[PDB]
Ligand binder design. Structure first.
Ligand SMILES: *[C@@H]1O[C@H](CO)[C@@H](O[C@@H]2O[C@H](CO)[C@@H](O[C@@H]3O[C@H](CO[C@H]4O[C@H](CO)[C@@H](O)[C@H](O)[C@@H]4O[C@@H]4O[C@H](CO)[C@@H](O)[C@H](O)[C@H]4NC(C)=O)[C@@H](O)[C@H](O)[C@@H]3O)[C@H](O)[C@H]2NC(C)=O)[C@H](O[C@H]2O[C@@H](C)[C@@H](O)[C@@H](O)[C@@H]2O)[C@H]1NC(C)=O
Ligand SMILES: *[C@@H]1O[C@H](CO)[C@@H](O[C@@H]2O[C@H](CO)[C@@H](O[C@@H]3O[C@H](CO)[C@@H](O)[C@H](O)[C@@H]3O[C@@H]3OC[C@@H](O)[C@H](O)[C@H]3O)[C@H](O)[C@H]2NC(C)=O)[C@H](O[C@H]2O[C@@H](C)[C@@H](O)[C@@H](O)[C@@H]2O)[C@H]1NC(C)=O
Ligand SMILES: *[C@@H]1O[C@H](CO)[C@@H](O[C@@H]2O[C@H](CO)[C@@H](O[C@@H]3O[C@H](CO)[C@@H](O)[C@H](O)[C@@H]3O)[C@H](O)[C@H]2NC(C)=O)[C@H](O)[C@H]1NC(C)=O
Ligand SMILES: OC[C@H]1O[C@@H](O)[C@H](O)[C@@H](O)[C@@H]1O
Ligand SMILES: OC[C@H]1O[C@@H](O)[C@H](O)[C@@H](O)[C@@H]1O
Length: 602
């Protein structure tokens, strides 16, 4: 007879209910299971009725794989899922958090902290739009973004993933969501999931909640704050996310007052689901349920019970799916987890899948492949990088000539520093590899290449990675541009109690600026100890992690555009002051939140 769930003209809620009523326990638990492409095979996907796949950081089909290679991979998995009895399409997720950043040749946008510097939500919406297109270029339908953490301590390894220490700025930047997913209809019910169709992707507000509030910025640790503080600082942007129809929410590894977020029924069910009326699906973080226990994974049976009873809908396993499925099945057969809980998880997963059009377009569109790295998107990334730059100093004394903007025509100029010609360094973490990497890892333009592309043909450009003082004094240079800063990092590898840049960095700046007027470009995920760099430099720019389009930097250095970025975080005098945020009783910054010098276009 007629099968209502397969009928594209029927309302989503009717299709969900029709399909849910047909499913076995195995088919239901399958929908709740998300696995790594690394453990996926056609038989695994078919036999376990798997609901979702992901690529973790650096999980790619081949080094340098084309958009088509990605589409073929995703479609191979989909074909297996579509061959099950009910033919429920899988959804494939990835960390597309500054562009489609795992993919070779994808446009890499500035990381979130630099976007916060722009104070430009429409720019961020446009970045969401371009990112959706590059993700769909690779056949992927689901991006684990935006990170709406409000980072309250820059010692956190993920501080660069947070738009600001100020929740109001994070709130405004939730415009990423309708960029990724499309604008919701007039009349939209807050908390319903939304994706416009096959040219958009499902978004994910993460990581719920207080991931940016942990003690001493220790990643995955305890956020110790009263309910009023949680609701005033860490929660607000989730409500903007509900209003904008975010499709999914990912749970944080962190704890709130000692309770694991992955086990917190009060917040996940009581608050997110029952108060905010969230109707999309709630996903774990990677091995998030394993980490409820200490040691992690020491009581996986408890991990499954605690997380599923808390209200999580989809588990990012991501590897040991057999153990997950077996344990969850046993809990349901034993009456420990009720069928109502399973039915709720599956209703939410199917709701997102039907809403986004996945049953109508389960396969990739080969005509989208050319969206990857498209020049228009690179032009956008270049605009964003330029807008993100914060000018901290432009002259050593109030009476010096301003150094910036620099002249494009000069006899001889010097470009120097470990970050001047290093694409990997300028992109930072979550670029190609999970932790990012060094050197030419993708298609882009380094600061050195941007300088050579910008200057008059008569300008001789000399590159020296780490010149000594005599080299500079003898070189006959008009000025120097020196780029230094942090190496790429992600998650706990970025936790850092000293916040001092690696050497050589300061030593290079001192050698260069001691011999010729210099503009220092600081590449970092966060404020770092900066007084010695300032003391040496004529001009200093905080460029954050500007991504693949290094011409964004030189657009401002050479005065094609004026500097406009403003600090989205407090710049501390000393790490012993931390945590120290705008509005604090004792607020003694080196530069306040909102500080930024300006220039005018030449
Ligand atoms: C402030 O605190 C931070 C965080 O705790 C700390 O930085 C970390 O230091 C660790 C050692 O103390 C280091 O762990 C080791 O890393 C070895 C390899 O490290 C290189 O490659 C990784 C990526 O694979 C980078 O992240 C590192 O920055 C480092 O990169 C190299 O750095 C040199 C010097 O600038 C450069 O010339 C190279 O080109 C560059 N290489 C690359 C590929 O980019 C590893 O093999 C060891 O087994 C060990 O695990 C850890 O990586 C680092 N984390 C970072 C930077 O995010 C600071 O202390 C050190 O800084 C490093 C760079 C080094 O110079 C140490 O001697 C410093 O003490 C702390 N600062 C202080 C205490 O003043
Ligand atoms: C030389 O540089 C000056 C400093 O940048 C610049 O004056 C600024 O111009 C900008 C852009 O027009 C002004 O921003 C606006 O401020 C409004 C009032 O609050 C906002 O409602 C606007 O939205 C806009 O704010 C920006 O929105 C985007 C976001 O990303 C930014 O962070 C945010 O600032 C800004 O207030 C001016 N600042 C000051 C101190 O005056 C000069 O531009 C002048 O000439 C033109 C371009 C015109 O816009 C004038 O109003 C402006 O004063 C610039 N001079 C020249 C000759 O180019
Ligand atoms: C926040 O971070 C702190 C610091 O990492 C966490 O405390 C640490 O927890 C680990 C257990 O995961 C402890 O390691 C264990 O130590 C015992 C010795 O007592 C040893 O026998 C075990 O094999 C294991 O290595 C570690 O000592 C401990 N450190 C401190 C200073 O307490 C803390 O649990 C984190 N909090 C949250 C909510 O995540
Ligand atoms: O080390 C590889 C894996 O580690 C995980 O903890 C990261 O979150 C994944 O993105 C990554 O694929
Ligand atoms: O790679 C999937 C997930 O891995 C986790 O380790 C990170 O915390 C998330 O930000 C990421 O989306």
């Amino acid at each position: 007879d007629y099968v209502l769930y397969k009928d594209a003209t029927k309302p989503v809620e009717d299709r969900v209910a029709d399909l849910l009523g047909r499913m076995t326990l195995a088919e239901k638990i399958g929908q709740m299971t998300q696995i790594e492409r690394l453990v996926a095979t056609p038989d695994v996907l078919r036999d376990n009725f798997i609901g979702s796949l992901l690529s973790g950081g650096g999980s790619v089909p081949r080094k340098g794989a084309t958009a088509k290679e990605w589409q073929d991979m995703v479609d191979g998995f989909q074909k297996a899922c579509m061959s099950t009895r009910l033919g429920i399409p899988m959804i494939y997720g990835i960390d597309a958090v500054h562009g489609q950043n795992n993919v070779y040749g994808a446009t890499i946008f500035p990381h979130n902290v630099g976007l916060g510097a722009t104070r430009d939500p429409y720019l961020v919406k446009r970045i969401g739009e371009a990112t959706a297109l590059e993700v769909r270029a690779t056949g992927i339908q689901y991006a684990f973004a935006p990170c709406i953490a409000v980072c309250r301590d820059p010692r956190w390894g993920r501080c660069y993933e947070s738009y600001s220490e100020d929740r109001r700025i994070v709130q405004s930047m939730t415009e990423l969501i309708p960029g990724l997913q499309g604008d919701v209809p007039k009349d939209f019910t807050s908390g319903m999931p939304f994706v416009a169709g096959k040219n958009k992707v499902a978004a994910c507000a993460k990581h719920f909640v207080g991931d940016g509030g942990t003690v001493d910025g220790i990643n995955e640790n305890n956020t110790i704050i009263n309910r009023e503080g949680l609701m005033n600082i860490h929660m607000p942007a989730y409500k903007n996310a509900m209003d904008k129809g975010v499709s999914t929410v990912m749970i944080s590894y962190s704890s709130w007052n000692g309770v694991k977020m992955h086990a917190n029924q009060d917040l996940v069910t009581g608050y997110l689901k029952d108060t905010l009326k969230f109707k999309g699906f709630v996903i774990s973080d990677w091995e998030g349920i394993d980490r409820i226990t200490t040691p992690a994974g020491s009581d996986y049976s408890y991990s499954v019970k605690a997380s599923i009873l808390a209200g999580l809908d989809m588990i990012m396993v991501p590897n040991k799916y057999q153990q997950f499925i077996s344990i969850l099945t046993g809990h349901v057969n034993g009456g420990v987890i009720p069928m109502s809980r399973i039915d709720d998880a599956v209703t939410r997963i199917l709701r997102v899948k039907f809403t986004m059009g996945l049953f109508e377009n389960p396969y990739a569109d080969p005509a989208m492949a050319e969206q990857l790295g498209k020049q228009e998107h690179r032009d956008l990334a270049r605009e964003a990088a330029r807008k993100s730059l914060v000018l901290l100093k432009n002259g050593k004394t109030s009476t010096d000539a301003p150094l910036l903007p620099l002249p494009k025509k000069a006899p001889k100029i010097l470009v120097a520093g470990s970050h001047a010609d290093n694409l990997g360094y300028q992109c930072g973490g979550w670029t190609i590899e999970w932790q990012g990497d060094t050197g030419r890892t993708t298609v882009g333009t380094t600061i050195l290449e941007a300088v050579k592309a910008a200057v008059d043909p008569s300008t001789v450009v000399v590159f020296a990675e780490n010149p000594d003082a005599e080299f500079v004094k003898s070189g006959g240079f008009s000025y120097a541009i020196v780029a230094v800063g942090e190496h790429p990092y992600t998650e706990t590898k970025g936790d850092n109690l000293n916040l001092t840049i690696p050497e050589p960095g300061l030593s290079t700046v001192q050698a260069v600026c001691g011999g010729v007027r210099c503009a220092t470009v600081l590449i970092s995920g966060r404020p770092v100890v900066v007084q010695p760099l300032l003391a040496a430099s004529d001009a200093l720019v905080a460029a954050w992690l500007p991504g693949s389009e290094g011409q964004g930097v030189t657009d401002a250095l050479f005065g094609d555009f004026g500097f406009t970025g403003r600090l989205p975080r407090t710049w501390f005098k000393s790490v012993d002051q931390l945590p120290m945020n705008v509005g604090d009783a004792h607020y003694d910054p080196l530069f306040r939140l909102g500080y930024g010098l300006t220039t005018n276009a030449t």
